Amino acid sequence: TKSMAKAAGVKSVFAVGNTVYMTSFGRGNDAVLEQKIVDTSHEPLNIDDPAYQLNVVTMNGYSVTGHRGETVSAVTDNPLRRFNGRKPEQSVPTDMLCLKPTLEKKFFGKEFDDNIHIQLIYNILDIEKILAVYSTNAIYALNNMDFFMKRTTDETFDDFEKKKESTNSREKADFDAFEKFIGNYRLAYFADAFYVNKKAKNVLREDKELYSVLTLIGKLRHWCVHSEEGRAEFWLYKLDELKDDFKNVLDVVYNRPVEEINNRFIENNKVNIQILGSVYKNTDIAELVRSYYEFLITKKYKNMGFSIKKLRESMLEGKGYADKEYDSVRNKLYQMTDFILYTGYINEDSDRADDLVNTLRSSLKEDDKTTVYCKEADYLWKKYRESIREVADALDGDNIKKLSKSNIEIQEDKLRKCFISYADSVSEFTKLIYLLTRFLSGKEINDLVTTLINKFDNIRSFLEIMDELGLDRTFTAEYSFFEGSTKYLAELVELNSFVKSCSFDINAKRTMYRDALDILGIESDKTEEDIEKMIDNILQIKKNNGLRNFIASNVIDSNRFKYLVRYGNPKKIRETAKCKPAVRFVLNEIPDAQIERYYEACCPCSANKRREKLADMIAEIKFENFSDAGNYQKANVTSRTSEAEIKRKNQAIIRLYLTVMYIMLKNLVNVNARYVIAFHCVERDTKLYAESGLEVGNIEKNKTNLTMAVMGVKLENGIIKTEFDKSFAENAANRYLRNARWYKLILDNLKKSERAVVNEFRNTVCHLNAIRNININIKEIKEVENYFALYHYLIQKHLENRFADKKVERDTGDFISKLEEHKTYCKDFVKAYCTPFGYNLVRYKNLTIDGLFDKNYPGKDDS
RNA sequence: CACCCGUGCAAAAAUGCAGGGGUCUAAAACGACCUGAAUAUUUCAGAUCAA
Ligand SMILES: [Mg+2]
């Protein structure tokens, strides 16, 4: 399944002039040089400790055999022969868009006869892609509830507040909209950016810097998503030119987590440090703290080259720590067991690790990789056994009371040089994305930073290569941001420590308790006068608050609820849970082992029988079922009573209602996140082809103005009077549409599109108006087979409700008509408005055709 | 079981075999991370969360 070349230690194969070079795997993403090649003449490089020897060489292929771990012998192809097999016969390749020179011409100053510079640039374009996604999901959480879109840094608050007294209609409404923003309750969900702790309490920031926050991410969107022809295209890459109003707020928010961690570190982590001093009698306590700091905070147990937990999961599988006795003590155990291994492999077992890394690289099946983890595990279990049970028997409740109530004094002399830098040292770029992440979910943060560290590390490893070979590495004066890529990399690794750890929660307000019951269900006949009394009994205007805690612990403190209110609007959500099919599609994707865990709690005999009873249990759910919570809140969930058995029964139902509906809204906005990428790349590629001598035109009026110019076709009077021919395909403007089949099919689809529906298709995906109004659009559908179908029903029904009183054509009305007969998405209508990116073909196919969309749920092509 | 490319065979414009691709997609290898229903600087529960 996996490539034999990269198991033998081959990393890449570069082309320079007539010469050909070759690389190999080093430390992580470091690049080690190996044999160069000139027409069957190979000079070896790195004579000391080579990874693989090439045994046979020729013009069209390079054989190899590896020296590390599992010996693998493989084959490798020549770049210079690419596109030259059966037809000058040796020349550098070019990208499938035929756009290599203009990119080299822009970042760097000149064209090169290499392929090393272009592998670099396609990683720079991949961070603007990922930055173009999450900046859009951020603004939507603010915009959900024109102001946000036209927004820049040259308008400081002293200049913006002048528009209060303005006589103009726009400037007056622009400011009056700002006051309507800060005068909203929903900012409590964004407390990390909008609140500060200061008798003492937690309140909003000064009104000056709230503007500075949203102004700063508001241009991030308008920059990433657009081309920005002018001198503002270098905004993100020139952040040292900002006003002082923006730099200061970044420092204020970047320094509040570190001061929560490293101000007092010994006292809140006082338990684990004591429980370790017991096993490592011989070690000096001061350096142990240094290790436990850089283990826990900096996560240096996640850059080792292998996975510590997969070893952990295999060694203590059936050793008796999976009981319910070890539930609260569990994370205390895994934090330490992962440390005992980390200090093992760092100092004494360093050689046993390098063997593991060079083994997993040279593994061609997953059954091999899974075995070696289980091989090394039994060695670890017989070695680290008494130290483990010496930990578990120390975590027995009462012992933690004594260890938390105890006096200790330890020198921070060693530790204070491993601390995290404050905001005064790090750059504005790393501080910017931190601010951004505080408008996002959990799984979205990791995908952002984890993607960026790889793309900078990949950018690094090419720059050192081109130093070793004597090439022009100097960026142009405007893209000098990347010459310090070694710096911005490490800043992001520090950021991956505490971006996910610290979250500052607010004491719940009244309005949250209304959103908590609206999402959960309110009876029909109840009026506005009555619901404000329902919570008046919750908040007790003797005082019993057992119900206030139920609605705060099981609902508000859930990471699920914190997501649904950001991207949703809670009353739209309960109205959406009345779609039994979609709700049932989310249940039958869950394993039956989870279902039998939920069911046995919520019931007091097959899978699909249980799965129906959980559906209709969701469709009937109300706050009034939980108004009796004052009686059983105080009960402990683990005891054996009636209140406890009732309590967990009432808990899991909420945990199921929210968990199910977290998944639906998550997959749909992630599916939405792949089309914003597509319209980014359309305005990206348009300026590039236009610079290459081609003539496209304007695109904000017609999004199909590019892919026609790629073909060489046009419309004369609103439509295409040109027919199919092969002179166009062979004479296309990129390597994709040189083929005559997909040239033809896109032309067929493209002649039945229209200009108006496409320009609306952008404003529906880039603004997320499709799931902003989800219940209106998802009223009735027969079935749900995948999240691709569902999203493509909504965005079609959003266009029916938009094009209901307007002019349309025969092709559009025939598609909308097939949307009413069959209550689902018209497959031939997906690929009409999804035409504007046909100049890229494998993108067009993956987004228009199920089975090719998601790499985890594969299918079949159309043919 | 998607796209492109090199090779060997049968061909005569395209098909079988065996492989490669960071320069093809959300998408190179280990790893991190996601799919995922499974939060982590803090043992749990309870209590403390709008006047
Ligand atoms: Mg790529």
CA of A595 to C1' of B34 (A): 23
DSSP state of A578: T
CA–centroid distance, residue A30 to ligand 1 (Å): 18
Dig out the tokens for A150 from the structure: 């036209």
3-class secondary-structure state, position A57: strand
Tokens 């649904």 belong to residue: A564
- State how far the Cα of A188 lies from the Cα of A192, in Å rounded to an integer: 9
Q: How many CB atoms lie within 10 A of CB A441?
A: 20
**Of residues A213, A212, A219, the one with CA closest to residue A238:** A219
Residue at shortest CA–C1' distance from B30:
A361
Nucleotide nearest to A82 (CA to C1'): B5
CA of A635 to C1' of B8 (A): 76
Question: Residue A204 pairs with which residues in a beta bridge?
Answer: A195
Instruction: For strand B, give the nucleotides within 7 A of a protein CB.
Output: 1-7, 19-51
- Residue type for A575, please? E
Dig out the tokens for A6 from the structure: 């990269």
- State how far the Cα of A490 lies from the Cα of A532, in Å rounded to an integer: 52
User: Cα A660 to the chain's mean position, in Å?
Assistant: 20
CA of A85 to C1' of B16 (A): 20
Q: How many CB atoms lie within 10 A of CB A113?
A: 10
C-alpha count within 13 angstroms, C-beta hemisphere, residue A356: 20
- State how far the Cα of A382 lies from the Cα of A319, in Å rounded to an integer: 12
Residue A186 · residue A135 · CB < 8 Å: no
Question: Residue A19 pairs with which residues in a beta bridge?
Answer: A16
- State how far the Cα of A77 lies from the Cα of A267, in Å rounded to an integer: 59
CA–centroid distance, residue A348 to ligand 1 (Å): 38
H/E stretch holding A31 reads strand A31-33
- State how far the Cα of A269 lies from the Cα of A512, in Å rounded to an integer: 33
3-class secondary-structure state, position A539: coil
Residue A587 · residue A580 · CB < 8 Å: no
Nearest-10 crossing angle of helices A787-800, A642-691: 70
User: Distance of CA A790 to CAs A136, A553, A659, A676, A855, Å?
Assistant: 21, 32, 19, 18, 18
User: Cα A850 to the chain's mean position, in Å?
Assistant: 22
H/E stretch holding A145 reads none
CA of A395 to C1' of B43 (A): 8
CA of A641 to C1' of B47 (A): 21
Dig out the tokens for A63 from the structure: 């054989």
Residue A827, judged by CB atoms within 10 A of its CB (0-12, 13-18, 19+), counts as middle
Instruction: Measure the CA dihedral A294/A298/A300/A302, to 10°.
Output: 150
CA–centroid distance, residue A126 to ligand 1 (Å): 7
Residue at shortest CA–C1' distance from B49:
A507
**Of residues A71, A70, A94, A97, the one with CA closest to residue A84:** A94
What are phi and psi for residue A636, nearest 5 degrees? Answer: -90, 135
Residue A683, judged by CB atoms within 10 A of its CB (0-12, 13-18, 19+), counts as middle
H/E stretch holding A52 reads strand A52-53
Tokens 């569902």 belong to residue: A790
- Residue type for A776, please? I
Instruction: Name, in order, each residue with C-beta under 8 angstroms of A425's C-beta and a sequence gap of 6 or more.
Output: none
**Of residues A456, A466, A445, the one with CA closest to residue A124:** A456
Nucleotide nearest to A81 (CA to C1'): B6
What are phi and psi for residue A178, nearest 5 degrees? Answer: -60, -45
- Residue type for A677, please? I
Question: Residue A62 pairs with which residues in a beta bridge?
Answer: A57, A76
- State how far the Cα of A232 lies from the Cα of A843, in Å rounded to an integer: 29
CA–centroid distance, residue A462 to ligand 1 (Å): 15
What are phi and psi for residue A106, nearest 5 degrees? Answer: -100, -60
Residue A94 · residue A736 · CB < 8 Å: no
- State how far the Cα of A37 lies from the Cα of A113, in Å rounded to an integer: 16
Nucleotide nearest to A257 (CA to C1'): B41
Q: How was this structure determined?
A: cryo-EM
Q: Indicate the pairing of strand A195-197 with strand A202-204.
A: antiparallel
- State how far the Cα of A320 lies from the Cα of A853, in Å rounded to an integer: 43
What are phi and psi for residue A826, nearest 5 degrees? Answer: -85, 110
- State how far the Cα of A778 lies from the Cα of A793, in Å rounded to an integer: 7
Dig out the tokens for A303 from the structure: 């850059």
CA–centroid distance, residue A758 to ligand 1 (Å): 27
Sheet with A19-20: list strands edge to edge: A15-16, A19-20, A36-37, A42-43
What are phi and psi for residue A302, nearest 5 degrees? Answer: -130, 15
What are phi and psi for residue A515, nearest 5 degrees? Answer: -65, -20
DSSP state of A269: T
Nucleotide nearest to A552 (CA to C1'): B49
CA–centroid distance, residue A688 to ligand 1 (Å): 18
Resolution as reported, in Å: 3.4
Dig out the tokens for A519 from the structure: 């999402």
- State how far the Cα of A550 lies from the Cα of A627, in Å rounded to an integer: 10
- State how far the Cα of A445 lies from the Cα of A463, in Å rounded to an integer: 28
- State how far the Cα of A534 lies from the Cα of A544, in Å rounded to an integer: 15
- State how far the Cα of A759 lies from the Cα of A777, in Å rounded to an integer: 19
For chain A, first and last CA: distance in Å?
25
Instruction: Name, in order, each residue with C-beta under 8 angstroms of A645's C-beta and a sequence gap of 6 or more.
Output: A604
* Breaks after residues in chain A, judged by C–N over 2.5 Å: 87, 145, 198, 541, 604
CA–centroid distance, residue A704 to ligand 1 (Å): 25
Instruction: Name, in order, each residue with C-beta under 8 angstroms of A377's C-beta and a sequence gap of 6 or more.
Output: A311, A314, A315
User: Distance of CA A677 to CAs A562, A844, A851, Å?
Assistant: 26, 12, 20
CA–centroid distance, residue A122 to ligand 1 (Å): 6
